[PDB]
């Protein structure tokens, strides 16, 4: 796809949900930004731990390529967790994780070019005991709401295999 | 939003949109809702709280005949109160008898119900097996009534981050 | 023009999902003769059953037993994986593991595209819960995802059961 057209790409461990996304790049165009938030040469690569939005519209970096891949969401909540003061409250961290994700959101509806986004499913375990592991999980959950409601289309993995819930 | 199932089930892991979802299933119910709380909002819905013997507590009180529908958040805790209620809870075959009693009532008291019904339960079983059995036995009880409630519901939903996967529909 | 059957299924889902029921009604669909293999760590009444914790390719072959049934149920991938792990001299060391599976999972593999009969296997999905600390039980989810991805590239049908209910992944 072309435009500021979204893709989100969710799954578990080992559900080839990373794979599957760089597939889906690869449609977008040769020139890919691999956004990493913890290879082909003609991809670059942007490291943002936080502020996805921001640095990515600082660097300039839309104007020169094809499309996005971001890797991961995972890691921007669980970085967002653990930038707080007290990663045990949950309402400081809830609101900083939806700031970054609504700001995300708006970049990719300006967005010159399509973006795929990475992220885990970790909500359909059994729930942790320690406030932090809990309050991550909760977190996650919310940004996945967030970006699968804003994206044209959702893929949820199964073993390597997608499973369409939202298509255009 | 589905319309005109009698009994739907919609279940989710952790932040999954399932209640929601739920909730927007029961508003095409018509706007007189009763909401049947298991733990321990529109203004014109009626809240009912049953920690446990849902079935019971919800005929007893009459207002199946005062609502255009139900909405029962959630399963999950249904489930761990029941377990909670045992002698031991490290137990498994009590709590399990105990468990499909109260889905099995709830079920007969559904198909008798003249509203419709949307339940709310939770995914626990695709993460990785815990240790003490106390945590086996309620996430095995729970997929147990999860079994039951979808083969008696005429539609059931997995929610995937917010959004519905239908995985049966009348 | 007569139609034909699934070859390979794969049927995977999570605890308490009726992941086994669901694949027993498409192996009696198979034929009224089925190999049942079980897996765990040493029913119709037309059903043979064959107890294999290890090597299941080479049991099932060197048994003969494929060319005396109608079709053959895996039960299951799961404790298959989770006797790999724990036959190996360090249960904590991730590469040992991974490859003794993955030579299991290609063993399977090579005997299903020989095999006269149909198999289904099942499965557990394991990896949407939160990943936990120690480096064992993370490697066991690792290694049962990656045999999940090996078996479901090759099935020609795949269920993911929710509930006792299944979604089609794959088929056709």
């Known amino acids: 796809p072309r435009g500021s057209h979204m893709t989100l790409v969710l799954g578990g461990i080992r559900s080839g949900k990373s794979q599957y996304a760089e597939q889906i790049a690869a449609g977008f165009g040769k020139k890919i930004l691999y956004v990493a938030t913890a290879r082909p040469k003609s991809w670059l690569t942007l490291e943002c731990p936080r502020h996805v939005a921001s640095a990515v519209g600082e660097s300039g970096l839309l ?3 094809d499309g996005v891949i971001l890797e991961c969401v995972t890691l921007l909540s669980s970085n967002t967790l653990y930038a707080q003061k007290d990663p045990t409250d949950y309402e400081p961290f809830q609101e900083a994780l939806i700031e970054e ?3 995300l959101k708006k970049l990719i509806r300006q967005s010159p070019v399509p973006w795929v986004l ?19 999980c909760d977190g996650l959950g919310i940004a996945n709401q967030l970006l699968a409601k804003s994206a044209d289309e959702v893929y949820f993995m199964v073993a390597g295999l997608p499973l369409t819930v939202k298509k255009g």
Request: aromatic share 4%.
């Open 101 to 103: 994700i609504e700001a």
């Open 63 to 65: 104007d020169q390529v």
């Open 118 to 136: 990475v992220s885990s499913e970790t909500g359909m375990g059994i729930s942790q005991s320690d406030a932090e592991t809990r309050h991550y």
